[PDB]
């Protein structure tokens, strides 16, 4: 269950989901580029910095 | 364009072609534009799937009129070659029409599939 999606300024999509992962999806092709296992329970909310330099994930 | 109940979602397109292949093995399928028109005019047709890759698109546009007169659901898939080798034909099939019977798991699948087509409309 993809609880939170947000979009980077350069086009990529950051998505926290039910596994507590944070996936980085490519912007032009819409495929995933990275899976970051971060949390134990599910990531509930994301935030992306205005210049696209920091991602905050809250589970 | 003129293909306004278009099936664009690939999950729904895969469900439509899987039900077409199952009806083709059940011999519950009418392949081709003329045979589709005959089944829709006779009223034995439960659902009708046209293809939008037809190069003159106007050779299948008469079937939406007969389906609007007979109240059967029609839907457009993207690729006629995909529809053709979904039926198991080795030709390009531009319109197919899958029929109903008394009691089948296939008939339950037909009812659910025309519910999904009504969700598209």
């Amino acid at each position: 269950i993809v609880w939170a999606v947000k979009c980077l300024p350069n086009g990529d999509i950051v998505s926290g989901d039910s596994t507590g992962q944070v996936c980085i999806w490519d912007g032009k092709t819409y495929t995933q580029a990275q899976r970051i296992q971060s949390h134990t329970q599910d990531v509930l909310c994301l935030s992306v910095s205005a210049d696209g330099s920091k991602i905050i994930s809250g589970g | 364009s003129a293909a306004w109940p278009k099936a664009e979602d690939p999950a729904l397109v895969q469900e439509l072609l899987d039900c077409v292949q199952q009806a083709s093995h059940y011999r519950q399928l009418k392949k081709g534009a003329n045979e589709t028109t005959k089944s829709v005019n006779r009223g034995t047709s439960e659902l009708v799937i046209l293809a939008a890759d037809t190069q003159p698109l106007s050779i299948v546009l008469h079937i939406p009129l007969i389906c609007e007169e007979k109240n059967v659901p029609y839907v457009y898939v993207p690729s006629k070659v995909a529809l053709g080798r979904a039926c198991g034909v080795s030709r390009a099939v531009i319109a197919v029409s899958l029929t109903s019977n008394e009691a089948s798991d296939l008939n339950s699948k037909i009812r659910a599939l025309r519910d999904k087509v009504e969700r598209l409309a």
Binding site: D26, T29, T31, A33, Q37 | P10, A82, R85
Partner: protein, 243 residues
């Protein structure tokens, strides 16, 4: 051997392999340097034969006959251009790498955090450069991934995930050895590079209701897509498209 003409071929049946298998043959492979055929069946036996039709007293004599304990052999492959190691695997959750010099067989059983994703090691492809090896992870769920493993250290280095309906039909490494082309079921084919480590592109097979196999070969192809000229994708209806 001549350059062959496009309507008839001078194919010529030679002396068949003398040792038969007790089950179906899952995989054949030729050594990249020497004329040595490796056959592997579901009856847990690999046979290495040397191609000698003019041999005596048995044509195509057997070098060795390796029985792997309790593993059916679904696939066996040679590694690299030199053909130094044989990687072989089946339904189980481990795969062996047998070095042909010094004879040691190491049993890789962990894929470094993705052991839950891989309930099998049956289908894999070693790169033509021999550096990498890709294994389809047994996790279908509307889209299949494949974990990519450095051959020399047997460690996870990447993962390529495509979207489909039942996962990955087949895949093939590019000829230069960097990327790989992953043909999933329901027609989506995906070129995925190793340098940028994300998807180069996605295209669709023409009218495929579901793919079954793919192969990729030739030379003088596009330089940024691996340098292989032809891709051939065979579907479940019986139709094979060549692009």
């Amino acid at each position: 051997r001549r350059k062959l003409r496009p309507e008839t071929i001078d194919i010529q049946r030679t002396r068949d392999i003398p040792d038969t298998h007790k089950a179906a043959i899952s995989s054949l492979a030729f050594h990249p340097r020497y004329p040595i055929l490796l056959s592997s069946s579901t009856s847990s036996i690999m046979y290495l034969h040397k191609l000698d039709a003019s041999a005596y007293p048995t044509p195509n004599p057997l070098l060795t006959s390796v029985h792997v304990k309790r593993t059916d052999l679904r696939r066996a492959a040679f590694v690299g251009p030199d053909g130094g190691e044989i990687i072989f695997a089946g339904r189980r959750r481990y795969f062996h790498c047998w070095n042909l010099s010094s004879g040691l067989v190491k049993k890789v059983s962990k894929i470094q955090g993705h052991q839950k994703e891989q309930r099998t090691m049956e289908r894999f492809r070693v790169s033509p450069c021999g550096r990498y090896m890709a294994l389809v992870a047994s996790d279908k769920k509307g889209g299949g991934m494949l974990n990519i493993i450095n051959v020399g250290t047997m460690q996870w280095i990447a993962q390529a995930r495509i979207d489909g309906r039942h996962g990955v039909a087949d895949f093939a490494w590019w000829s230069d050895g960097n990327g790989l082309t992953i043909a999933g079921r329901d027609g989506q084919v995906t070129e995925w590079s190793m340098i940028t480590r994300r998807t180069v592109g996605i295209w669709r097979d023409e009218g495929s209701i579901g793919g079954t196999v793919m192969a990729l070969g030739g030379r003088n192809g596009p330089a940024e897509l691996g340098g292989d000229r032809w891709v051939a994708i065979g579907s479940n209806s019986g139709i094979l498209n060549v692009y």
